[PDB]
Amino acid sequence: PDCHIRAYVCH
Amino acid sequence: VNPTVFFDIAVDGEPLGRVSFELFADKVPKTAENFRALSTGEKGFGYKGSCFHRIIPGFMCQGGDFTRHNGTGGKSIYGEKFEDENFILKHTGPGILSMANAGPNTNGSQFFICTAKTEWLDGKHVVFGKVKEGMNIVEAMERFGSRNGKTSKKITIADCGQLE
Ligand SMILES: *CC(=O)Nc1ccc(NC(=O)C*)cc1
């Protein structure tokens, strides 16, 4: 459940 | 009154300090109750002994995998997953407690403690609590983090429960 990190990396 | 839970944090088995949290049961009761019961262990499983598997300085500390200890596990007290209860509360700054997920309606046990305002998470992750005391302990945890979250020392919830 790493959606919040994926958002962070792409951002 | 909103419940208060605590984590006693250890670094490679040595006590670091206590973090306590107010859980916003008045606004997200189902999500708050999940975290509360996982903090006491009263269902036979929960956060005690688990590790903070991703610590990203300036962003958040993530934990809650007590079923696989590999960053992919965890489960709620309602079953494997539960629905996003609401998005009333926003990621307003350091200390916010919010649910990790893999998409809509996939809440389990994994959570993160924000160390900054993260408004770009609003509407995607359910906010359900905040650090009450021990933000200095959360900052101490940040010092062990890295770019993508792997930790330089083992950061554990050595004990956890619910305060009076
Ligand atoms: C659930 C999930 O995987 N979320 C997510 C958010 C952002 C991104 N990447 C970008 O926005 C560029 C991927 C996945």
Numbering used by the authors:
A (entry chain B): 1 to 11
B (entry chain A): 2 to 165
Share the article's original sentences:
Here, we report a rapid, high-throughput screening platform utilizing phage display that enables an unbiased mapping of the α-helical interactome of a given protein without any prior knowledge of its structure or known binding partners. Biochemical and structural experiments demonstrate diverse functional impacts by the Helicons which bind these sites, including inhibition of protein–protein interactions, inhibition of enzymatic activity, induced conformational rearrangement, and induced dimerization.
To assess the ability of Helicons to bind and modulate the function of enzymes, we screened the cyclin-dependent kinase CDK2, involved in the regulation of the cell cycle, and also the peptidyl-prolyl cis-trans isomerase Cyclophilin A (PPIA), which binds non-α-helical peptide substrates and catalyzes the cis-trans isomerization of proline residues. Cocrystal structures of Helicons from both Clusters C53 and C54 confirmed that they bound the site ordinarily occupied by peptide substrates or natural products, providing a second instance where the screening platform was able to identify an α-helical binding solution to a site ordinarily recognized by peptides in a non-α-helical conformation.
